[PDB]
Each structure stands twice: as structure tokens, then as C-alpha cells.
Design a protein around this nucleic acid. Structure first.
Ligand SMILES: Nc1ncnc2c1ncn2[C@@H]1O[C@H](COP(=O)(O)OP(=O)(O)O)[C@@H](O)[C@H]1O
Ligand SMILES: [Mg+2]
Length: 962
RNA sequence: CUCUUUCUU
């Protein structure tokens, strides 16, 4: 079977920009190039995707001697074959971009067939003549980011004049003297602070302390490398601040600190606040999304995630004295972005000091990055830890694989059967029987039971790939007789999309006689510290998001963690007392793990980050990314540039239009930002914002019970006769708002009854409120964002909701599909796909829907391309908002996006299609004058009126029985 | 058949 998967994966969307290079000729061209340049390199099919979903992966690595670069690729696949095709296409496109191969120009082929039957659409005479009048009316057919030392009457964090309080005649010198006197008095009198310094002097970092300061005082860029638990993050900023205060210059110090994760930043800020024996928000503050406590403008340490600093960079960095980047080894997009921006900072302004601190980096690489900068190694760690591997526990608890899986069970190197002959025979058989991709719950239960038998107090930490395995393990352990006793063991998950209360529950102490088992993803990997952690159990798997750009496919892959991730998870233990680190993989597998995971820049879209580049005015995108540490593939850069230019956020000169600036200021996908602005023009910004926020969450609203492959009848009614996920999400959020407003326990019981997710609703509402606030900041009047109650039970027409569903087509372009029966739909160019089990439109019967056109939010690959966040849309909405060009096919059939066929009058088709440039002009004029969107010239008011009349559900149901 | 790595004043 599964020819449909090959047909769907061969699909291409952006072959036009890359010189007509597609899958069908990419492998041939790559083979020809390799033969010509006598390159003997070959694919590295890296099997992944566990075993119930044996996907694969692939990665060539051709080397271009002439230019001296090394053009490389990394792609996903559902069977070696397809991946290799995608990798070859990426490599060929990249090699084309630096002009080493001529653009393709000959011929491909056409199989089409299966052409879909036309869908008749008719419009009422009043609608047509209104469109005619509307058409007649609308006459239709670089600089340097600045820096400055701290100044009087200026706030560093807010970058605004104070003009308030009694801090007007207070100079910097007087403030520094007051700070020095206060610090001396605190040191002399308070005994808790003195005890804290007595503890701090015992840390290894103290032995290096003095010389570290010298480096900071002699070189703008300093790299610090040391073992985990040696006290870098909570000590370096304090050392700098205390030196500045004691040296009579306490008012001239401002030390930013950047943490890779929210919980890490919060925990480190709290620990710094406790170490100075002071309340939060006075000297040390933190600023993460949806939670910010700010310290005094002078002599303060601010902990913020990298994205927060990137958003702060728009206002400039006037008044900062030091910037610290922790966990630089993360290699993600924001870290490298901040690295380039900080290099520019140091080069332009030598007074600013930048300190890079981490535990496991290539010191030579980052030193040569900054044009040779000092690197200081901190020797020694806090306490030693004992490390074990899978075969060690197998010998060390006499575990035997269950007969259960022994038969339930029923050339890639399987390291689980390779081990030293020092160990016993039965241990070797037990190690060999276990598979690699899957995990064993019997193994974990036996290991935890033996740890209990060890009678060593302390928390247990289990690192897991994702939510599914975490909650499956929670359910499995809860059913056990021993671990089900809440008085003996307490199990806490640690996930970013879990409620914030549960995230903070991982730091609070537990009562006597109970052991805390924390099941975490890689959120608990870096820089956090829990006092009672003694045991770290590493499953050695990490999940990443693979994005195939040529077919616009997304997937989640559970791949083996690198050695750096394992070393950091090991370092999470043994910070206050010696412990154990049980790592679950063979010693051969441990030796076979990659050094570091691939950086995010090589496997992520760059449209948002290129837009941010243009916002802060660093210059051309291509040159800026050529200045980056690890240059992203040129094809991704050109795809981002074309995506922004085509959507009109950049003019012909690659400059920033006001729409581009406004979309840059929003924390949303640029397409979602344009869609939100259009929703604001039509006076439906509340629903528009909440719906856009649900389309950038990667979380689920409805929680199908473990296994059930459909929602049910409580949840599948929220959607109501609309048969759309977004209307159901709106109804659920509207009910949940009232339920919370009447009680928090009411919120919990409502979420239990209706089968929702409390954390998903909270994050969606918070993102929607932030979007509304930012839209208000730009000048859009509040009258455009009044909350509109949605009645999903009403069938027929609803202007606001229908125009919202129509604007979805513009916001989720080109994610459109056509349903046939049961769960089978066709995506663009008629590629077969399945409706996901979570979506409310999934059905086991051969039921039919009124309008067979859908727009979905995500296209996830599994063992069958699946779709996510579906919503039904009328043909008129699709024609208006879901295509760029509309043409005329044979026998008078209108063709949309070269794959949709409509039976509609060509004259009226041209009439309706002429409105899209008018809509672009409306967006431009609305973003130009945000305060003047609700009042407009008469032609644009008529345009809005006819668009509202066209976006009705039954606007094209005249004379049709349907 | 596995709905949910991290981040965005
Ligand atoms: N909750 C806590 N209880 C006791 N000690 C702590 C706690 N949090 C942090 N510490 C101590 O503070 C130090 C901070 O180390 P840190 O600089 O975060 O390590 P790294 O340099 O790897 O980030 C650690 O050595 C740890 O012993
Ligand atoms: Mg290394």
C-alpha cells in the first residue's frame, strides 16, 4: 500500500524560486555533480522514530572546495528512500544558491488525473451589482543600534525617563555612596547574610574569583568554562556587582543575564535574591514572558530569557555595563542571534563587557568566534557522582525481561547486544533482549524498587522525551501498590505546558517520609537546581520538531540525546550531596552518541528572525547571517526573504514597511499577524486574537482519554453545527472564562466535566490578551476589539464568526483541503491525508458535510500525512482569502491555486478576485494610521461592507439545494 | 497509531 505517502512527500510548493529544482531531478543532479567532482560521500540514513513508527532521517555533507564552504543538509523521511530525496533536494537548492550549478530549465512531467468535479457557486444580483459599484469606486480593474553609559534620571530596563518620585536631584555618585554604606552595614550587622558569605566562600568559583574580575576589567569578551555545580551563574554577576559597589561605583553597574529557559531564569533569580538575603525586586529582578519583577534602575542584576532580551533590544541598551549569556552551548536560534548582536555591541562600543558562561562548550570554537578572547577554566566540582549504564543496572538488580514482552516482542547496528565479557551470561541475555527505541516500565519499576531498598533519602529525577511517555509512566506507577501511597512517594511532572503551579511545585519542599519523583522533559536540563535531588535516571531521549520545507510538513522525532545533554542531566545531580546517575543505554551506545545535537538554525524557519533583523536594523539579512556563528542554509534564508516580500512586509528595496514593523513587534507568526490586523480592520479583534493564539501553541484543548481515538459528544458539541475546531475552542474558552469568574474550583470541575485542559486555556487566554494589548499600543482603538459572544448552536448566518472563518483562509494560507468521506481528504495538488483523531470532524461513519472545503492549522507526518486544527469554509471564503491567482480552465471552469475547480461565472470570478489588491491597500492604509481604522473613506467602507456580505456562510448558496 | 521539545517585556 502507501503509494499515497510517496505521492504526498514528492509534493513541492516552492520550486519556482529555487530555479525549478524539485525532488524528481534533485537526486539525478546531485549524482551528476558528485561524479563530476569525484566526491565519494553518501547518505547517512540515521534511523529514528522509535519502532511503532520507523521513520528515518538523512544527512549528506557535500564539500564545495572552490568557495571553501561546506554545504550540508539534514532532512526527515518516512522510509530511507523519501528522506534521501528531500536531503538531495535541499543540497541541490543550496548549491544553486551560491551559484555552483546552473538552474534547471528542461522538462518534468504531469500525472494530475483525478481532477475534482467543479463546485457550483452562484451569487445574488444585489451582491453582484454591489461588487460592481465597489469596483467602480475603488477605481479597480544601515544605522547603528546605540549604547550609552548609565545617566541620571534614566531607567535602564524601561529605556524611558523617570520624571517621578524623589529621584530627580539624586546623582549617580550619591546613589553609589548610599549603596556602599548600606552594603557595609548589612555585612557588619546582619548575621544571615554573613553566614551566606561564609557558605559562598567555600564554592570552587571563589578560588578563581579575583582573576575573573581582572579579565572582565581587561577584555570586553570573556568565556568561562567549568564543571556543573561550581557556581558560575549565581556568583559571577554578584561578584561584578559587589566589586562595582565596593569600588565606589555602585550606580554605574547594570548586568543583564540571559538564561535559556523560563523556569531556569525564575529559579536562578530567586536563588540570587536569597543569597543576598533580600526580597525580590530590589537588587535582583527577572523578566520572562507573563512574569516580570523589575529591580532599581541602577546597580541591579536582571535575569531574562534570550527572547526577552531580543524583544528589549528594540529600545536600545543605554545604561548597561555587563551582559552575561549562560548556557551558551544550547546552539538554538536565539543564542546565536544574541551572539552576533553582542559581537556588534562589543565592536561598536568597547566599554560594554560581555561574558559567556557555560559548562560544556568548545572553547577554541567560541574563542576564535570573537577574534580570540580570553577563556578561563574553573577547576573542581562540588561533590562527585556515580555513573551507571543500562547493563550496569541489569547486573545490579538481577532484572530479567518479562515473558510478557518476551513474546509480545513479536542492518542497523543494535548496540544492546554489544558489551564487555566481564559481565555474567544472564546479564548479557537480559541486556540483549531489551530494545533501544522503546522503554521498559518493568525496568523502571525494578530500578526504583531497588533504589528504595537502598534506603537513601532524596528525590528521584527521571528525564523523559515528552508528555505522552511522562503521563503513561505516571499512570503505570500510580497503579503500583507501593508508589501509589501518597504518604511514601509523590510524583510530579515537569512540562512547559503544564500549569505554572505544577511547575513551581518542583521546588517546594516535601513532607517528611515522602520521596519526590520528578518526571521531566529537557526543561529541567540546564541551570536549575533542586535541593533534594540525589538520583537522576536518564532515559536518553529528546524530542525535536522536524520541518520539511519543500512539502511544508511537520513532525516530532524522539532521537537519542547527545553527550552534552547527558553530561548536563548528570550535572543536575550532585550539587549539595553525592548521588547517583543511572543512564539507560549500553556503554557502546554511550560511546556512539553524537557530541552535540544539530543547531536550531539549520532546521527551523527564519521568517520571524529575519523580520526581527529588519526591525532592529542590523542591515541585509544575507550579510548578517553570513556573519553568524553557524551560517544557516542559504535556501532557508531565501525562502524567508521571499515569504516576507510576497506578503508585502518588505518593499522592493528590502526595507521595512509599517506593516512589517508592526508584525515584528508582535510575538506571533507573521502570517498570523497580518491576519490579526485584517481582523482588527473588520472589528472582530477579540475572536481573531484568541483564534490566532490557538494557532501558535502546540498544545491540545480537548484531552481524549489515554487511547480513545476521537473526542466524544461532550466536546464534539462545542464545535456545534459549525463543524470547526476554532468555533469549538471559542465556545470552550467563553464558558471557561465564566466558570473561572465564578470559582477556581469551579474552573477545575468544569475542565474535568467538559474534558478540556486548564493550562491550554490559560496560555491561550494570556497570549490573546498580550496580542490585544500590543495591538492597542500601536494605536488601534478599543472599539475594534469588543468581545463578541459566539452562539455555535445557531445554524445559518453569523457575520462576525463567518468573516473570522473567512479570514482564517488568509491566515493559514496555503493549508487548505477537500474532504471526500469518513476521514479522507486531499491537500494541495490532491495529496491524500487523514483527519486527526483529536479534531472534532473525525468520524468513523461515512457521514457527509455541507461544504467540503476545510482550512487546517498543522500538517503532521505520522504513518499517514495527518491534518490539525480544521475548520469548514465556504467556497467564496476560499476564493477570496485562500489563493493568490485565479485562472480560467477549459469548458469555463475557474481554477484556484492550480488544483481547485469551481463552476462560477468567469466575469464575476474576476470581479471578486480583483478585491485582493484592494484588501492589501486596505491593510496598508490601516497600518499607516492605526487610530483611523474604524473611520475610513467611503470606498473602503463599501469594500468592508461587501467583504462582510461575501464572507457569509450562505453567500454562495443561491438557487442551490445543497 | 505516539494528541502536546524550548522560547516570544
Ligand atoms: N535550592 C538550593 N539549595 C542548596 N543549594 C543550592 C540551591 N540552588 C543552588 N544551590 C547551589 O548554588 C550553586 C549554583 O551553581 P550554578 O552557578 O547554578 O551552577 P552552573 O554554573 O552549572 O549553572 C550550586 O553549586 C548549588 O550547590
Ligand atoms: Mg565536548
Amino acid at each position: 500500500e502507501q503509494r499515497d505517502m510517496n505521492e504526498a512527500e514528492a509534493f513541492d510548493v516552492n520550486a519556482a524560486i529555487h530555479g525549478n529544482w524539485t525532488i524528481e531531478n534533485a537526486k539525478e543532479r546531485l549524482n551528476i555533480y558528485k561524479q563530476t567532482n569525484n566526491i565519494r560521500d553518501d547518505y547517512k540514513y540515521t534511523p529514528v522514530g522509535p519502532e511503532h513508527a520507523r521513520s528515518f532521517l538523512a544527512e549528506l555533507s557535500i564539500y564545495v572546495p572552490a568557495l571553501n564552504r561546506t554545504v550540508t543538509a539534514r532532512e526527515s523521511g518516512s522510509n530511507k528512500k523519501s528522506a534521501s530525496k528531500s536531503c538531495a533536494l535541499s543540497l541541490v537548492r543550496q548549491l544553486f544558491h551560491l551559484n555552483v550549478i546552473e538552474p534547471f530549465s528542461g522538462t518534468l512531467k504531469k500525472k494530475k488525473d483525478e481532477q475534482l468535479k467543479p463546485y457550483p457557486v452562484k451569487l445574488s444580483p444585489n451582491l453582484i451589482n454591489k461588487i460592481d459599484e465597489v469596483i467602480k469606486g475603488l477605481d479597480l480593474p544601515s544605522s547603528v543600534i546605540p549604547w550609552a553609559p548609565p545617566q541620571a534620571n534614566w531607567n535602564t530596563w524601561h529605556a524611558c525617563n523617570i520624571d517621578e518620585g524623589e529621584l530627580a536631584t539624586t546623582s549617580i555618585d550619591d546613589l553609589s555612596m548610599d549603596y556602599e554604606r548600606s552594603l557595609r552595614d548589612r555585612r557588619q550587622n546582619d548575621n544571615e547574610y554573613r553566614q551566606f558569605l561564609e557558605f559562598r566562600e567555600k564554592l570552587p568559583i571563589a578560588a578563581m574569583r579575583s582573576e575573573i574580575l581582572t579579565a572582565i576589567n581587561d577584555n570586553p569578551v570573556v568565556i568561562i568554562r567549568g564543571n556543573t555545580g561550581c557556581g558560575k551563574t549565581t556568583q559571577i554577576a554578584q561578584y561584578i556587582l559587589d566589586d562595582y559597589i565596593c569600588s565606589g561605583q555602585g550606580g554605574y553597574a547594570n548586568i543583564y543575564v540571559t538564561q535559556p529557559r523560563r523556569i531556569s531564569a525564575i529559579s536562578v533569580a530567586e536563588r540570587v535574591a536569597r543569597e543576598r538575603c533580600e526580597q525580590l525586586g530590589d537588587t535582583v529582578g527577572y523578566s520572562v514572558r507573563f512574569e516580570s519583577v523589575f529591580p532599581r534602575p541602577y546597580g541591579a542584576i536582571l535575569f531574562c530569557t534570550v527572547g526577552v532580551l531580543l524583544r528589549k533590544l528594540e529600545a536600545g541598551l543605554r545604561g548597561v555595563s555587563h551582559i552575561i549569556v549562560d548556557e551558551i552551548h544550547e546552539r538554538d536560534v536565539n543564542s546565536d542571534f544574541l551572539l552576533v548582536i553582542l559581537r556588534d555591541m562589543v565592536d561598536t562600543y568597547p566599554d560594554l563587557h560581555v561574558i559567556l558562561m557555560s559548562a560544556t562548550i568548545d572553547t577554541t570554537k567560541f574563542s576564535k568566534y570573537f577574534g580570540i578572547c580570553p577563556v578561563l577554566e574553573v577547576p573542581g566540582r562540588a561533590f562527585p557522582v556515580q555513573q551507571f549504564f543500562l547493563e550496569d543496572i541489569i547486573q545490579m538488580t538481577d532484572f530479567v525481561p518479562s515473558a510478557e514482552s518476551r513474546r509480545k516482542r513479536k542492518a542497523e547496528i543494535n548496540y544492546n547486544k554489544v558489551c564487555e565479557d566481564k559481565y555474567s551470561q544472564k546479564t548479557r541475555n537480559a541486556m540483549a533482549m531489551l530494545s533501544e527505541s522503546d522503554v521498559s516500565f518493568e525496568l523502571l519499576e525494578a530500578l526504583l524498587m531497588h533504589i528504595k531498598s537502598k534506603n537513601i533519602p532524596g528525590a528521584i529525577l527521571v528525564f523523559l522525551p515528552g508528555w505522552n511517555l511522562i503521563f503513561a509512566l505516571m499512570k503505570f506507577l500510580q497503579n503500583t501498590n507501593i508508589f501509589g501511597d501518597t504518604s511514601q512517594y509523590q510524583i510530579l511532572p515537569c512540562h512547559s505546558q503544564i500549569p505554572r503551579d505544577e511547575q513551581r511545585k518542583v521546588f517546594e519542599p516535601v513532607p517528611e517520609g515522602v520521596t519526590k519523583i520528578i518526571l521531566s522533559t529537557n526543561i529541567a536540563e540546564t541551570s536549575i537546581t533542586i535541593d533534594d535531588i540525589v538520583f537522576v535516571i536518564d532515559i536518553c531521549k529528546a524530542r525535536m520538531k522536524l520541518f520539511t520545507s519543500h512539502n511544508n510538513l511537520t513532525s516530532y522525532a524522539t532521537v537519542w540525546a547527545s553527550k552534552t545533554n547527558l553530561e548536563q542531566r548528570k550535572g543536575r545531580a550532585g550539587r549539595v550531596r553525592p548521588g547517583f546517575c543511572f543512564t539507560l543505554c549500553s556503554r557502546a551506545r554511550f560511546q556512539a552518541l553524537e557530541d552535540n545535537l544539530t543547531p536550531e538554525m539549520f532546521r527551523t524557519p527564519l521568517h520571524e528572525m529575519a523580520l526581527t533583523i529588519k526591525l532592529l536594523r542590523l542591515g541585509s539579512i544575507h550579510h548578517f547571517l553570513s556573519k553568524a556563528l553557524e551560517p544557516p542554509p542559504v535556501d532557508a534564508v531565501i525562502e524567508a526573504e521571499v515569504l516576507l516580500r510576497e506578503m508585502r512586509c518588505l518593499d522592493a528595496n528590502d526595507e521595512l514597511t509599517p506593516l512589517g514593523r508592526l508584525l515584528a513587534r508582535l510575538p506571533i507568526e507573521p502570517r498570523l499577524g497580518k491576519m490579526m490586523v485584517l481582523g482588527a480592520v473588520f472589528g472582530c479583534a477579540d475572536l481573531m486574537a484568541i483564534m490566532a493564539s490557538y494557532s501558535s501553541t502546540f498544545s491540545e484543548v480537548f484531552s481524549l482519554d489515554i487511547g480513545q481515538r476521537r473526542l466524544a459528544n461532550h466536546q464534539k458539541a462545542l464545535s456545534g453545527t459549525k463543524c470547526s475546531d476554532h468555533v469549538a475552542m471559542i465556545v470552550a474558552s467563553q464558558m471557561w472564562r465564566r466558570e473561572k469568574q465564578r470559582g477556581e474550583h469551579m474552573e477545575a470541575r468544569f475542565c474535568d466535566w467538559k474534558g478540556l485542559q486548564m493550562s491550554t486555556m490559560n496560555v491561550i487566554w494570556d497570549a490573546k490578551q498580550q496580542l490585544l494589548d500590543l495591538l492597542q499600543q500601536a494605536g488601534f482603538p478599543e472599539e475594534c476589539m469588543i468581545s463578541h459572544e459566539v452562539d455555535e448552536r445557531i445554524d445559518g448566518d453569523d457575520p462576525v464568526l463567518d468573516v473570522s472563518l473567512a479570514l482564517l483562509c488568509l491566515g493559514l494560507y496555503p493549508n487548505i483541503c477537500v474532504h471526500k468521506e469518513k476521514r479522507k481528504v486531499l491537500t494541495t495538488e490532491s495529496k491524500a491525508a487523514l483527519l486527526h483523531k483529536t479534531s472534532v470532524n473525525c468520524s468513523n461513519l461515512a457521514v457527509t458535510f455541507p461544504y467540503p472545503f476545510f482550512v487546517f492549522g498543522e500538517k503532521i507526518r505520522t504513518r499517514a500525512v495527518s491534518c490539525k486544527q480544521l475548520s469548514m469554509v465556504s467556497p467564496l471564503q476560499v476564493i477570496l482569502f485562500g489563493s493568490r491567482k485565479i485562472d480560467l480552465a477549459a469548458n469555463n471552469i475557474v481554477r484556484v491555486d492550480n488544483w481547485l475547480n469551481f463552476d462560477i461565472e468567469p466575469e464575476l470570478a474576476a470581479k471578486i478576485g480583483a478585491l485582493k489588491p484592494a484588501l492589501e491597500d486596505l491593510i496598508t492604509v490601516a497600518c499607516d494610521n492605526p487610530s483611523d481604522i474604524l473611520r475610513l473613506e467611503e470606498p473602503y467602507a463599501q469594500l468592508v461592507k461587501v467583504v462582510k456580505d461575501l464572507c457569509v456562510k450562505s453567500a454562495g448558496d443561491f438557487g442551490l439545494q445543497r
